[PDB]
């Protein structure tokens with residue numbers, strides 16, 4: 001069976017795990033745990049990192065012996081599963097929109113892990129994010145999903161990162177309420193609800209120590 | 210006729226410009242200049258930013274009314290031009306390889322920016338000291354991946370070669386010592402630089418190995 005490896009955190013793994021849930025794909029989850037305080041050693045990972053046949057060793061990774069796939073890179077992993085489950089654009093027009101939003105999503109990840117991993121930084125996130133969330137609200141418009149009536153991989157990516165931000169400071173979404181309905185639309189998908197109601201599910205931690 | 214807009218810096222725009230050159234596609238280059246010292250105001254950009262019909266106004270941008278395309282996001286723009294010109298994977302095996310390398314490339318862009326655009330002298334050194342510990346293993350990864358290949362996927366150039374070119378150059382011009390034992394990569398950069406249309410581009414009067422980043426940044430300012 002396919003293996004998804006990652007830390008015991010939501011982090012970058014979650015959008016992938018949400019996609020696997022929605023699609024019903026069987027996979028084994030290989031979770032690597034950090035060390036005790038304040039060591040926080042990554043040995044569980046570092047001792048295996050270079051021995052898994054990965055071209056660019058890193059977390060997350062995705063392995064499927066049957067298909068001959070050993071992969072790293074979150075966007076590349078989720079793009080791979082999306083094309084395997086038809087969660088991609090059916091037109092270049094759609095694909096343009098999807099890939100803009102993919103990159104807009106990662107732009108929020110990138111400048112959130114610059115703040116979370118900072119008095120002057122958290123002050124600066126607060127000034128920027130509102131305009132970015134307004135942009136996304138204006139893009140979603142009255143659509144059920146970011147690209148329209150059909151759910152695509154980019155909805156899972158957007159879900160995770162917007163949740164992270166909501167948990168950080170909900171006040172930011174005050175000027176973008178549509179997203180809260182969007183986050184609920186996604187939370188109400190049958191397999192996502194079942195994933196979010198697991199015993200294994202833990203909204204925290206999202207990032208490491 | 211199609212319009213590519215960006216700052217007057219190599220930055221994120223160069224991989225796109227390299228692809229357009231190689232493919233021979235006609236485009237209008239629209240370049241926004243920073244203001245004087247120390248304002249460097251983005252006025253030229255900020256005055257137009259919201260008048261171009263862009264969903265997520267940002268630089269770089271690409272517009273082609275004939276095709277109905279108004280786009281932003283560097284990775285999305287280069288993937289679009291690649292699909293249009295056949296510089297993408299022809300198999301899932303290739304697409305996996307290309308997209309891992311795409312993302313491995315951007316991971317280096319992201320890390321270098323943090324270090325180069327940092328202002329605090331203490332933080333910049335801490336970041337640099339940390340870049341130097343990481344990049345050797347990243348370059349080994351790329352060398353191991355390229356193997357004996359002409360280009361990153363074999364004998365056929367894909368969009369991700371132009372991305373890799375730009376970012377490896379940025380790193381070379383920052384610390385060549387990192388490539389002292391990376392001949393495969395140095396020969397790779399030479400293979401790309403000697404493509405007929407890339408040679409012409411890098412030999413333009415317009416071209417300038419600097420600036421790479423913006424004035425605010427410590428490295429690549431000019």
Ligand SMILES: N[C@@H](CCC(=O)N[C@@H](CS)C(=O)NCC(=O)O)C(=O)O
Pocket residue numbers: 011012049057058059060072073074075312313316
């Ligand atoms: N470009 C990679 C970056 C992955 C990454 O930064 N992973 C972090 C966790 S957020 C890590 O600790 N990786 C383990 C390592 O680099 O050894 C991706 O997006 O998949």
Ligand SMILES: N[C@@H](CCC(=O)N[C@@H](CS)C(=O)NCC(=O)O)C(=O)O
Pocket residue numbers: 103104107216220221251254266267268269281282283284
């Ligand atoms: N994810 C975006 C990021 C673009 C970006 O950060 N552009 C910088 C130049 S390095 C800029 O100054 N533009 C922001 C603005 O002024 O709107 C992309 O790659 O297109």
